[PDB]
Design a protein around this ligand. Structure first.
Ligand SMILES: CCCCCCCCCCCCCCCCCCCC(=O)O[C@H](COC(=O)CCCCCCCCCCCCCC)COP(=O)(O)OCCN
Ligand SMILES: CCCCCCCCCCCC(=O)SCCNC(=O)CCNC(=O)[C@H](O)C(C)(C)COP(=O)(O)O
Ligand code: SF4
Ligand code: SF4
Ligand SMILES: [Zn+2]
Lengths: 140, 51, 10, 62, 185, 65, 166, 53, 110, 385
């Protein structure tokens, strides 16, 4: 309804009308990911959640709903998240890490050692829906 | 001059749980007695590295 | 409980 | 006193008389403040020395 | 955001030939790469949106004097907003240069020097790599399994010249190593 | 120097006093050394050492039994 | 934003050091209150029965020394302070011929006290044993046994008191 | 069998919320206590100067 | 500046060795100036000492090992030049019948 | 820009701190702390001593939060051993960790204030810290270095007359905190000597690894005992203070609020204290009762083989992490399967805080550096291991 006022985090000054910049970044990432091959999981996931974020932010018109129906932090954190994603896209295009080597092995271990209930273990709440729906498309 | 060997099973006990391991035996045989309290003194830094 | 399986392609 | 060494000081303590065949020695009167319990089978003609305490036990009669 | 979800995602999203092997267990998720695709792996794990690993906790080091690749440096990571931990490790060598990660996480500048000091694994494109913990005139790397516990040099004050001079080690009572190891285990 | 009462004596001559407060610590029990030549900084025996440091509620005269 | 009524109060307060005289008056409330320090040579601080101080080798009420040269204390000491040498006496029982502790290496951690199966070694409540020479700190067997004899009437009571634990 | 613990019924409540008091001199009255004192004192100094003269 | 990547071949390490020796010679007046030593030693035979220490380890062929010796030598040089090493140590490091009978007379372990 | 050598030989700057820095005459450009003067060598000495003998190493590191340090080692060993500790031991461990937090916060606040110049609250807070060092004297043998916490449970049970004294202390500790706070928060000089000093952004804190109060002084709600609760902390109710600006004043306010929350947690743990045993019983890593090993054979065998050989941790490796008063303290244990640890790296929270000093003192006064040192609460036992 009004301006963001304080963001609650130092060094993260409020960006007025962040929806426009966020949409711009999402569009640039969507139109820049065409370099890497389709078949790979990285593209298959970045296109997925970038497109989901673009649709969910274009449906809404204000920050207090954009961050609300995402639930992925404040509308301003998404800005540097998208900027970092674009930087990663560019760097990995420069790296070109594609091509599965013919002599490739990967010893995947499934060790299951129980630990007590009183040791420091990260036990957070469930993720939003898109984080789970992305892996369905990634696998299939 | 070092000796590479596998320590043998101790006679007094019948378990073979300490076998199959190889060690480097630096010959740090230079040890004497402190003439105040009878402690064992060394001048060789490798007194117990290999152990 | 140790499941140690090594990957391989083609 | 401190002139007598403990080895020569324990020997003068009179041996204990036990009616039974085996006597359990626990060190002090309180079991938790003494050495672990030691059962000694006193059958010879010489006193049986407690290995922890040094106390000697002699069997008088059954 | 938990162990299993991250395992699936980093199994699918990560490009191959990067992670030589990986583990999933309650103790911790591991990603053992091959000492060359380290900067790339950390850069991907730092910038990706679904894995926003931002803070590097510490850079460990383990000396195994039984394998060909003697040393093994361990990178502990943490994602603040996802509340999850990733432990990436490599295999090093006593005469080999493993890449540095100061560009991504500036905090690594001192653990880098400490790992150089303790073990002797040098690094590339690191501004300083100077000894940080041992003495200025110190020789050898102490955390190696070769280094004796007592050390090689002692320190004492001699009156003929009014200064503190180092000297060969000579201990009054040697370090008694008690061999408690027993069979049936 | 002065206090509520006097708690026993010692073979070394020093007298042990005892004062009781209500809710705050300080000025509970102390020692007046028999001598005055630097008092050796350590003259309490083993029986009165525990009482002085609040280790035991036994006076020290009772600790003999 | 100001209303010409709050700027007056704020300017006056910053000009008359009110927030400084507040602390000035606060610091004076303990001036007339009773003090807390203790006359150390006469009254000493409160300790606990579990206090770990200077070591002491206690002995049986009969007169035999309580140590049986089991060497658990030597093998559990993290600082490696204790050195023991044993030998079978002509009496027949096993005893210590050389039991010394390096008080310079010792850290008073109480591991040796709780490792004895017979309570041979304990840490007495004596915390005043600073010496003048380094070689005096190397407590041999005779000095440590004399320490055990000196504090026996209180060491035994301390052991009996907190015997409900450990 | 005699574990140390809270008494039957629990311990008494404790406050920890940084209780704020007000022992300050005043808010505005000190300005008058200074200014009126200054005026009256300057008048007294004038009278003293006249007497000394 | 930053640590260079390890040399690919020996000829690329040889120029690194020459550069390190060059830098050591360039900085050699500073040690003689800030450590106050003029009558004990002249700068010319310090060149001989450095050359001897750099030619003793001349049989190493592995480029990585040579690079690591250059790295360690640079660290030692920076320690000496900066106020890290302490006096009477630089001069400590720098500047009959038969041996068997002497070794027999002095000790059993030689 | 001339260079002067800091490095005072006294605890009036925490001692053992070289800190060579660049000076333009009044504004410092680059400050280079020279750590290593207190590298005792614990990390090498850990591998030569069993899992029980290595516990007192952890008391020495960061020697103002003693029981908050060995707690991490105990948790790591328990995780590597799948050992379940009884509830009473967990509650008393939480209580004593909170006491460590209070001690560390008091010592840090008063040492920093005395560095600034305010010397009267220093002695007041050590008068109050006497009462808690006395509590440490009661449960354990020693006032400061107390090996109370063991991998199984705690070393010994609490004395009978302890909870009454602890609650009596907590009755007035809040008023003591208010007295100490009224002299500094409302003061004028304290504000101008702290506000807008050593500001750190959240991105900078994350990049430089400032987990702890420095991370939470930038607006990041990252509390390890709430994000990853280890002992019984879900039952306990407390708040996580989070700052707005990364200056030194908000860190001071955060530390005061942390002391408040620690007092609240101590009260909760005192109220909700269950009965039962203190040491674990599932695995054999706890000594038998001294009234039991003297009449049982298996118990005596266990006592012997534990106080000579120790418990053998199965071969694995892990990184634990607890919320030390300084910040995140973590122990990276590598177990060879024997009774001695193969490698035990210690992640000191003060190491990263000390390295991040270079950018904090960017374009500040020289006397503005001692307050930055004080506000980050650096002790050099943990920094150099
Ligand atoms: C019984 C006999 C007692 C004799 C002694 C009297 C009591 C003395 C007690 C002293 C206790 C306090 C001592 C503290 C020492 C340091 C205090 C200095 C504080 C300071 O300098 O702050 C300045 C303001 O105070 C000031 O400016 C101070 C000067 C104030 C003078 C008052 C002028 C008021 C004029 C009103 C006239 C009324 C009559 C008009 C007709 C600047 O403030 P800042 O820089 O920190 O903040 C931003 C402002 N830009
Ligand atoms: C006061 C100054 C302080 C620092 C003093 C220096 C301290 C460290 C000194 C470095 C110690 C070392 O061994 S580090 C340097 C060791 N590295 C080498 O010796 C390279 C192997 N040798 C060759 O390549 C050639 O034989 C060569 C002899 C070069 C020429 O022959 P060519 O042309 O056919 O090639
Ligand atoms: S543990 Fe006690 S009985 Fe055993 S050798 Fe040591 S002092 Fe003697
Ligand atoms: S107190 Fe600790 S360091 Fe001292 S002798 Fe006993 S076990 Fe060893
Ligand atoms: Zn007996």
């Amino acid at each position: 309804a009004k301006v963001k006022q304080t963001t609650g985090i130092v060094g993260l000054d409020v960006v007025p009308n962040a929806r426009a910049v966020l949409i711009d970044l999402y569009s640039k990432t969507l139109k820049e990911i065409q370099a890497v091959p389709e078949d790979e999981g990285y593209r298959k996931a970045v296109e997925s959640f970038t497109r989901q974020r673009l649709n969910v932010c274009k449906e809404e018109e204000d920050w207090e709903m954009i961050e609300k129906r995402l639930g992925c932090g404040q509308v301003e954190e998404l800005i540097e998240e998208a900027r970092d994603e674009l930087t990663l896209i560019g760097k990995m295009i420069e790296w070109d890490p594609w091509g599965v080597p013919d002599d490739y092995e990967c010893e995947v271990i499934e060790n299951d050692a129980p630990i007590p209930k009183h040791v420091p273990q990260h036990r957070p709440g469930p993720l939003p829906e898109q984080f789970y729906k992305t892996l369905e498309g990634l696998i299939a | 001059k070092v000796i590479i060997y596998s320590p043998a099973r101790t006679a007094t006990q019948s378990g073979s749980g300490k076998l199959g391991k190889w060690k480097i035996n630096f010959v740090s045989t230079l040890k004497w007695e402190n003439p105040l309290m009878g402690w064992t003194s060394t001048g060789d830094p490798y007194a117990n590295v290999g152990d | 409980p140790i499941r140690r399986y090594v990957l391989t392609k083609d | 006193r401190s002139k007598k060494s403990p080895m020569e000081l324990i020997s003068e303590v009179p041996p204990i008389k036990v009616d039974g065949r085996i006597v359990a020695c626990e060190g002090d009167t309180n079991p938790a403040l003494g050495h672990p319990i030691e059962f000694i089978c006193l059958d010879l003609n010489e006193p049986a020395i407690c290995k922890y305490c040094g106390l000697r036990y002699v069997q008088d009669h059954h | 955001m938990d162990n299993q979800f991250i395992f699936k995602y980093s199994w699918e999203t990560l490009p191959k030939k990067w992670v030589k092997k990986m583990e999933r267990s309650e103790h911790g998720n591991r990603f053992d790469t091959n000492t060359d695709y380290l900067f790339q792996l950390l850069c991907f794990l730092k910038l990706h949106t679904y894995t926003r690993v931002q803070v590097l906790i510490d850079i460990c080091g383990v000396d195994y004097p039984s394998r060909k690749r003697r040393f093994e440096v361990v990178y502990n990571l943490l994602s603040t907003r996802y509340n999850s931990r990733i432990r990436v490790q490599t295999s090093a060598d006593e005469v080999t240069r493993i890449s540095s990660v100061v560009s991504l996480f500036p905090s690594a500048g001192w653990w880098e020097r400490e790992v150089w000091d303790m073990f002797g694994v040098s690094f590339i494109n690191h501004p300083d790599l100077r000894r940080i913990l041992t003495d200025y005139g110190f020789e050898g790397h102490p955390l190696r399994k070769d280094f004796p516990l007592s050390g090689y040099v002692q320190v004492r004050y001699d009156d003929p010249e009014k200064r503190v001079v180092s000297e060969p080690i000579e201990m009054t009572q040697e370090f008694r190593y008690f061999d408690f190891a027993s069979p049936w285990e | 120097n002065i206090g509520a009462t006097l708690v026993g004596v010692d073979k070394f001559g020093n007298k042990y006093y005892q004062k009781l407060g209500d809710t705050q610590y300080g000025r509970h029990r102390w020692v007046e050394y028999a001598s005055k030549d630097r008092y050796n900084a350590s003259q309490v025996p083993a029986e009165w050492h525990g009482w002085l440091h609040f280790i035991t509620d036994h006076t020290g005269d009772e600790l003999l039994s | 934003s100001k209303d010409w009524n709050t700027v007056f109060e704020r300017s006056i307060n910053t000009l008359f050091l009110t927030e400084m005289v507040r602390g000035l008056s606060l610091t004076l409330k303990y001036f007339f209150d009773p003090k807390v320090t203790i006359n150390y040579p006469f009254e000493k601080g409160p300790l606990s029965p579990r206090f770990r101080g200077e070591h002491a080798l206690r002995r049986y009420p009969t007169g035999e020394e309580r140590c049986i040269a089991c060497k658990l204390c030597e093998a559990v000491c993290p600082a490696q302070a204790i050195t023991i040498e044993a030998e079978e006496r002509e009496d027949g029982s096993r005893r210590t011929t050389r039991y010394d502790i390096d008080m310079t290496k010792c850290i008073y951690c109480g591991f040796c006290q709780e490792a004895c199966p017979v309570d041979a070694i304990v840490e007495g409540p004596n915390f005043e044993f600073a010496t003048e020479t380094h070689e005096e700190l190397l407590y041999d067997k005779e000095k440590l046994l004399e320490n055990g004899d000196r504090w026996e009437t209180e060491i035994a009571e301390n052991l009996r008191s907190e015997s409900l634990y450990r | 069998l005699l574990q140390d613990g809270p008494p039957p019924g629990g311990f008494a409540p404790v406050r920890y919320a940084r209780r704020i008091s007000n022992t300050g001199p005043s808010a505005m009255a000190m300005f008058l206590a200074v200014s009126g004192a200054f005026a009256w004192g300057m008048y007294q100094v004038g009278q003293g100067n006249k007497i000394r003269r | 500046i930053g640590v260079p990547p390890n040399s690919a071949n020996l000829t690329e390490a040889r120029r690194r060795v020459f550069d390190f020796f060059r830098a050591a010679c360039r900085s050699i007046p500073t040690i003689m100036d800030i450590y106050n030593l003029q009558d004990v030693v002249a700068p010319s035979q310090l060149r001989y000492a450095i050359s001897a220490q750099i030619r003793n380890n001349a049989h190493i062929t592995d480029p990585k090992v040579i690079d690591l010796l250059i790295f360690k030598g640079m660290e030692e040089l920076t320690d000496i030049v900066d106020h890290a090493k302490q006096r009477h140590h630089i001069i400590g490091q720098y500047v009959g019948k038969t041996d068997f009978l002497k070794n027999f007379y002095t000790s059993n372990y030689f | 820009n001339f260079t002067l050598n800091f490095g005072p030989q006294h605890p009036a700057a925490h001692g053992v701190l070289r800190l060579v820095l660049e000076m333009n005459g009044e504004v410092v450009e680059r400050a280079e702390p020279h750590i290593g003067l207190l590298h005792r060598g614990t990390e090498k000495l850990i591998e030569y001593k069993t899992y029980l003998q290595a516990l007192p190493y952890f008391d020495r590191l960061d020697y103002v939060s003693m029981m908050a340090q060995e707690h991490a080692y105990s948790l790591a060993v328990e995780k590597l051993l799948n050992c379940e500790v009884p509830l009473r031991a967990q509650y008393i461990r939480v209580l004593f960790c909170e006491i460590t937090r209070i001690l560390n916060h008091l010592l840090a606040l008063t040492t920093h204030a005395m560095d600034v110049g305010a010397l009267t609250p220093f002695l007041w807070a050590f008068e109050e810290r006497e009462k808690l060092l006395e509590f440490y004297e009661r449960v354990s043998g020693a006032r400061m270095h107390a090996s109370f916490i063991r991998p199984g449970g705690v070393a010994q049970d609490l004395p009978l007359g302890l909870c009454r004294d602890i609650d009596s202390f907590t009755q007035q500790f809040a008023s003591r905190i208010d007295e100490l706070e009224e002299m500094l928060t409302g003061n004028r000089i304290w504000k101008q000597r702290l506000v807008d000093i050593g500001t750190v952004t959240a991105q900078q804190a994350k990049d430089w690894g400032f987990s702890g109060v420095m991370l939470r002084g930038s607006g990041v709600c990252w509390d390890l005992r709430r994000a990853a609760p280890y002992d019984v902390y879900d039952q306990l109710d407390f708040d996580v203070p989070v700052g707005t600006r990364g200056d030194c004043y908000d860190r001071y306010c955060i530390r005061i609020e942390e002391m408040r929350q620690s007092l609240r947690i101590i009260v909760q743990c005192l109220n909700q204290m269950p009965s039962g045993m203190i040491k674990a019983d599932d695995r054999k890593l706890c000594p038998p009762s001294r009234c039991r090993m003297k009449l049982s054979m298996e118990s005596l065998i266990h006592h012997f083989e534990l106080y000579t050989e120790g418990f053998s941790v199965p071969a694995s490796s892990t990184y634990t992490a607890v919320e030390a008063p300084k910040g995140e303290f973590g122990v990276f244990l590598v177990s060879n399967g024997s009774n001695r640890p193969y490698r035990c790296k210690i992640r000191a929270p003060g190491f990263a805080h000390s390295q991040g000093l270079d950018f904090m003192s960017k374009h500040h006064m020289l006397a503005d550096v001692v307050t930055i040192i004080g506000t980050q609460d650096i002790v050099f036992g943990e920094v150099d291991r």
